[PDB]
Amino acid sequence: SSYITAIKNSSVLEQSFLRAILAEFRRSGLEEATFQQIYSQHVALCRMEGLPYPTMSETMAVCSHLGSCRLLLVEPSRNDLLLRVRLNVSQDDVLYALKD
Amino acid sequence: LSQVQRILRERFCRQSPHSNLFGVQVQYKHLSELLKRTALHGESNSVLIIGPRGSGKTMLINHALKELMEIEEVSENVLQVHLNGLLQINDKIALKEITRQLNLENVVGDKVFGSFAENLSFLLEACPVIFILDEFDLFAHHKNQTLLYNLFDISQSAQTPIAVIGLTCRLDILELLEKRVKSRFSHRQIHLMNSFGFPQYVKIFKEQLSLPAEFPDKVFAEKWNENVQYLSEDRSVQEVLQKHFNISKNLRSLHMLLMLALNRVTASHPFMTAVDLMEASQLCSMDSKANIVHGLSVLEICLIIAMKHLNDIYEEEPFNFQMVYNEFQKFVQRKAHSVYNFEKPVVMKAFEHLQQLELIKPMERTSGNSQREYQLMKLLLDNTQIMNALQKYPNCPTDVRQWATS
Amino acid sequence: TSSMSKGCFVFKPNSKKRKISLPIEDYFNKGKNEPEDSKLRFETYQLIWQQMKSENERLQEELNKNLFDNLIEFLQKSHSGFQKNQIKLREIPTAALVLGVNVTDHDLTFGSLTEALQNNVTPYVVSLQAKDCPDMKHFLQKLISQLMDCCTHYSMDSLSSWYMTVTQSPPVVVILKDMESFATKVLQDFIIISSQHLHEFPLILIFGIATSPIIIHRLLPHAVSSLLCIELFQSLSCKEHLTTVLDKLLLTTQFPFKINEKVLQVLTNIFLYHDFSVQNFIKGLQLSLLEHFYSQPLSVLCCNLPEAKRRINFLSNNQCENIRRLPSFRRYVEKQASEKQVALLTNERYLKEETQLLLENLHVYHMNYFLVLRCLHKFTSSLPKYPLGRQIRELYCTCLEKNIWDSEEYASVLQLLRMLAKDELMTILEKCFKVFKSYCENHLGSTAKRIEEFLAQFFEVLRENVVNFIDCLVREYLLPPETQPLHEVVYFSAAHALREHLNAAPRIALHTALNNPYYYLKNEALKSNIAPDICIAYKLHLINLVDWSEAFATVVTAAEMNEIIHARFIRAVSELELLGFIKPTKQKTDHVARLTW
Amino acid sequence: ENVVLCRESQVSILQSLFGERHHFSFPSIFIYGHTASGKTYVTQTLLKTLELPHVFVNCVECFTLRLLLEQILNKLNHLSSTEITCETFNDFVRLFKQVTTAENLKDQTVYIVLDKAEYLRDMEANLLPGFLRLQELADRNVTVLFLSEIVWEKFRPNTGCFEPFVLYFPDYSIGNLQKILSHDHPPEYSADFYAAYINILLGVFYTVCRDLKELRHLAVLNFPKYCEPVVKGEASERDTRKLWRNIEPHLKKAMQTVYLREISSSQWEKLQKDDTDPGQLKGLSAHTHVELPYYSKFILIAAYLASYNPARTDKRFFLKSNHLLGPKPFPLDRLLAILYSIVDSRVAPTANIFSQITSLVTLQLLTLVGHDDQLDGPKYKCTVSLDFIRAIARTVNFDIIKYLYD
Amino acid sequence: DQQTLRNLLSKVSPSFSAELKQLNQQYEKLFHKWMLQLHLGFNIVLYGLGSKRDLLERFRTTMLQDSIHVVINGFFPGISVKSVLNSITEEVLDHMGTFRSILDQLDWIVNKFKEDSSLELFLLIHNLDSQMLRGEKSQQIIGQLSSLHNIYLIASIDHLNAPLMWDHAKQSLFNWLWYETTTYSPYTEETSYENSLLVKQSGSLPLSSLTHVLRSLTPNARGIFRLLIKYQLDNQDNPSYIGLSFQDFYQQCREAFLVNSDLTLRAQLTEFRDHKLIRTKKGTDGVEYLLIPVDNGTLTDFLEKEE
Ligand SMILES: Nc1ncnc2c1ncn2[C@@H]1O[C@H](COP(=O)(O)OP(=O)(O)OP(=O)(O)O)[C@@H](O)[C@H]1O
Ligand SMILES: Nc1ncnc2c1ncn2[C@@H]1O[C@H](COP(=O)(O)OP(=O)(O)OP(=O)(O)O)[C@@H](O)[C@H]1O
Ligand SMILES: [Mg+2]
Ligand SMILES: [Mg+2]
């Protein structure tokens, strides 16, 4: 499908962002998240991977890039650190696309 | 030199055409086949190009329509109509533009046509026509998608050859369209995804930062090209290109970085250097909220440390001015004596300034229902941003900093 | 006609071209007593009411002059900066006009202010209100409408274009009448837009503030409150306007109509306790005037004394016997001599002379009463402890209800007055002697040359003499008006009807009607089960609806296959929700007792 | 006349990106900065100095889309050289291409500065992506500048946009503030004297204020008081310590009154002129006493007891976790029960009493929550402080503090 | 019982008939006083226990005959101050046009009464305290009307908390004189019987009942319904192609942050089936409607009034 190959041809930090979303959803057991918990997991994943420390205005750029397409639908950017982030595609599809 | 600046500034600032295409040959072969199919024969077609922002969808249609226009006995008979979502928001304005670009504003006269399709039928009856619909999803949010339905219905049914190309950056573009217009839509999708690795990114770097072969000052041109070869093979240039590659694989950001590094070049300093790309990468990677919190007064920083303790103790619970003022009072007694011992109105003025910058947000939005105090608000700074900003806060009194650690 | 599935029925007298309507006089006379009397009383009413209205509107113009002098001084000071000025970051001059709590009389207070400005500072003064400016577009639309009236996507540049068209020098003055009610957004946007372009559009704002000036802080933030140069102003007090209008309407002898003590208590209570609105007092006086000239036929004699006696001279027989059966005249003949008893009743020509004599006696009683009242107020205000009252109207009420020296209150003011300093007494008799100066045509000139003699003396024996002088004066001339014959011609005493028309209590009426149906239905309906259905249901609920239904069924069957009693329960419960007693909840079929009384 | 100080790097970067007239610059630059950092001043002086055709538009004045477009197009038609009207964005683009083709404006970068641009995100949705892509849509060598106090990420539309170059105008430190405030020295007195005055003023007011305009205004106001010792002759130019000891207590009084705008500037300069000391003027504050009717007073001090006291305790106080959280809403029946309880005399439920209950709300002394079922209207709140109610209760001889809490 | 069955059982007669027959001519005596106080600049409000409709209608028959008078039904569910402005503007005055706003039409009619005094209008309101005329904007428009000298107004209030409607600014406009008329007639006209415990409910919901059921509900639920109200509004313009779909509704309501899961939307559409709000025509071969049966004009007038 379009969404799976779109996830596969995306950059490194967008894929790490989608992994933060998956792990945070596993922690929460819910389909929505405040952006704060996603960023707090994304910092830990960037530390584990070896990537440098991501600033808030880069993570917001990545999140708004994913929300500009429909891999993810989020609230207007007006509200910050207070967004509701939900996946638009199924979690198993995300794991299939990122496993490669 | 001035001419090098002029050519490369038209390459970077304006999105002016350059000759080569990076990894989009198959997609262009499909697109050019369908445009020559529409123009040469009488077949009517529809295409829905899908790709992220800055991935050259307009590059593909401009170069394809240019080579289509180059073909003999096509140029005299083919008419184009460029319509855009951000300009035309309602279908009557779209109708006005379709009359105006076809140069039939004199022909159409004062007659008011009974139905939209009758107006389009009169327009097209006075020779193929091509309809480039930029921002297709903005057309999709019309009242009942009337223009899209009429365009797809005329392309399917009428004899008059028509190509309807649409451009979107949404992967749910075939879920917004209502059930009749999907049925009228032939499902031809050309996906222009950025499928290129890091050595290909470095190749695009060196291809885009090089002069053309019709440049007059040839002797300067070859040494400029050898300089950009050495720059592309440099280590630190590779490091900043890797840092930009990890964020996105979009060529627009690369053209912004190259424009900044190009703009540093002056008459005295005539060749690019690794430090131009390093400093131009430093300019792009700034953190905005740290720059704002650097600008604050000392008292507003004391208020922010009080808010951070409030969110630390009573976790995920909103606050008003009275709790933050009480915690600040515990500060002005507990650490120091007769220093920072301000009255309530100046503290309220600082808190209202913090609200002006939108570093705090009113949780419930009403119309004058609440007074200035007792109004529940939330902090829009994470704890680690506050620690990083206090870390390099110019001359932050050891007292406030020691409060902040504990 | 009025019952159809639509909500507007308009009846016109069309196809019948007789549009002549009844003159208002025809509505005044609904009876057959005396129509010429009932048409002349309506002219007398209109005359007296126009006089009181004109006197009040002149008085309010006179009172607030002092505030306008300072305010015109401030607006003459402020515009000198524009005369020098090249904005140089000049602020917008504003005046916070702290008005009172009352809202009704403010429409007078601004209007005179408007005229004052149009005479002195500017010819361009416009007033805006919060009710008709919801957003910036409507705000600027009405701004450029009133500015163009004083002399299409309107913008501030279009205002400056009009200004440079008309001037080719004075400021423009915007009065915000109701500061409390404005939206916050239009105030901040108007201040920020106007502040940038004031160097070609001079702007002076007056804020009409009902409460304390802290409201300026509440609506306007500190980033916007620093763009104004603010100066505070305080207006009249409501109490002072009340005492002034009472002194110039009731206590003056110029107007023939008066009001009783209980009517005055009602109008003073609905002011002091509920709202400090003098315009409601003027409404109450107009209503008392209308009921007094509508009820009493012989109130045609309530005029100025020349017209009063020429109206006495020509009367009908029925008006003469109405005079003959007045209770004040009926007790007057009883204390009169035995020959004069038959002399008054048998002959109408003797009666026409006697009523003229009695009315002239009543008028000079009023003149003496009010003059001695002002002098007693001078003694009352001079004393520190303020026993009878602080003001003129409290003293007038307490003397009007009963004799002061009959009450034991007056011994206290005597004993406080008797021990006093010489200089204080010199000031007191100076004040009293300029009261005797103040009212000409005195019938107490002997007291005027007496108080000239005691002032000319200027110890404790003559202090006792002057205190006994005012003591004999206050026994002599202040008496309640009920002890004067023919007093019901110029007095109105209907307290309860006035109280019901002005200050109603529509909850007490419903509660009394439901708890006691016997007051309005005197057919033996209650002493401490036979009632209208609404009463029957109302008594029972004071709450599940089926138990209430069977209780109502039991009661009404005790009162007498019946399906109708359940239908009566449906109607009764439905019409109880229209009066606000039943509210549907979810715990039971229903459970609510929101009346709670 | 027009000097820019401590902004050398920032004006260098703008002059670099503008480049030459024939060259094409960025379609949009987004300048953001903390308050009083010289955004408007530096940009206006730079644009006026280089003699570039440019338009300055404030978005606060243009609360309508038509007003904004009309203002831009009319100012450009005056720069070219009666009245042109444009309702929609498309008509703006057509007429913009029409006015741009004048001989003076064919080949030069035309700037459209948009100051206070955070009010562009509350207007029509197509306006802000339309302006960011104006060089792409119109193709007329146009550059737009957005000046704002708000960081860029808040502006981002949901569907994305042509991302601009984000620039940061940094704050002034203590040295930059001192060498911008002392620059306009008074001609009568010594420059070092005025510099020491700026040194003590910045020494007092740095903690609560880092705004250039407010500090410049406070330096203007307090300067005749500073030089009164040298005028009286008790101290000289070089007796710095005596002057600082004189003005050091007065600066605190100027911080607590003028800085909060309690006492206006004219009354303040009158106080220094006529030698009347400050502290004898009440100011706009401390006038918190309003003369109210008797029943409205008791309604107000009954609604304050209804709002700020729990319903569970209502039995104990009247029939026989703090104030910090705020006012709790109450129903109207509680207001009538408390009102009937506290008043010693009999109260009848007349029309005037309900008119008073619905009047306090209009006078912003009370406030209804819900805004639903106005006739029933049970919900109400109390918006006044402890001191106002305590004063009113003292007037009618009622002990409010016994009833508030144990 | 039924509301129609309530209409059929009208057999009952009042017990105290002769006793209540003297309470009508007693109030009929005061008619000349009421008319005179109308001409002198006062207005009359009637407060009582029974229905004042018959008294006001007798007042129309006896006195206000040779005048251009207007009768207004507050008790009618489909009434608004916009309608009374139209009724003043189009037939009483000979204007035939459309006005931009209610305030712009109110200022036109106010100005029309300013330049001419030959017009006199009598404006009766049978209930001034009904739900449609409860708004502060509504009473502000009526207060702007009644304060002129060429127009007169008699109104009656029934609710126990009617004095909350008027404050000191608004009761300055109305020169009220409060007259008690405590007749004992039953509320046969003003009791609609709709949303009562009579189980029978007739036709589409009136706007008052639609608002009353919709206010005591989750704000997210008000949004979810507004979506279909606005959709059905833009779809109903021709009878062709009418009908929403449930997967399409899940798409539209997931785009917005209203519903989290499909089971939540199913639970929501059953809650709308509970109050007879939604008509589920799912399983229809053409399209799975999920439409609303409420009239379209009522839906527009609800959405404009909702906030
Ligand atoms: N694969 C590619 N081949 C050639 N040029 C490219 C490619 N990808 C990006 N570019 C360059 O990057 C820019 C892409 O932006 P362009 O205006 O062509 O379309 P776009 O921005 O994707 O369209 P939209 O604005 O609708 O997103 C152009 O300057 C183009 O020259
Ligand atoms: N270097 C300087 N030299 C002299 N004056 C300066 C300097 N910098 C700023 N100013 C003053 O600052 C004012 C302009 O400040 P500006 O409006 O740019 O602040 P701002 O941050 O835009 O404010 P806001 O927060 O209202 O947007 C001018 O009046 C100017 O006199
Ligand atoms: Mg494009
Ligand atoms: Mg500025």
Author numbering:
A (entry chain A): 761 to 860
B (entry chain D): 17 to 142, 152 to 431
C (entry chain C): 3 to 87, 94 to 159, 177 to 193, 212 to 501, 549 to 618, 625 to 638, 644 to 661, 673 to 709
D (entry chain E): 5 to 85, 92 to 330, 348 to 433
E (entry chain B): 268 to 574
Paper text:
The first of these, ORCO2WH, consists of a dynamic ORC1 AAA+ domain that is unresolved in the refined map. Interestingly, in this structure, the ORC2 WHD was stably bound inside the ring-shaped core of ORC in a conformation that is similar to the auto-inhibited state observed in the DmORC structure. Only in the ORCO2WH structure was an ATP absent at the ORC1·4 site due to the displacement of the ORC1 AAA+-domain and consequential disruption of the ATP binding site. In contrast, in the ORCO2WH structure, the ORC1 AAA+ rotates ~90° from a position proximal to the ORC4 AAA+ domain where it completes the major ATP binding site in the ORCO1AAA structure, to a position proximal to the ORC1 and ORC5 WHDs, disrupting the ORC1·4 ATP binding site. The latter position resembles the auto-inhibited state observed in the DmORC structure. A minor ORC2 WHD conformation was observed in further 3D classifications of the ORCO2WH particles. In fact, this conformation resembles the completely collapsed ORC2 WHD conformations in the ORCO2-5 structure where the domain is further tucked into the core of the complex compared to the auto-inhibited state. Notably, this alternative conformation does not resemble any of the conformations of ORC2 WHD in any previously reported structures of the various ORCs. Overall, the ORCO1AAA and ORCO2WH populations reveal a dynamic switch between the ORC1 AAA+ and ORC2 WHD where the locking into position of one domain within the ORC ring-shaped core kicks the other domain into a dynamic state.
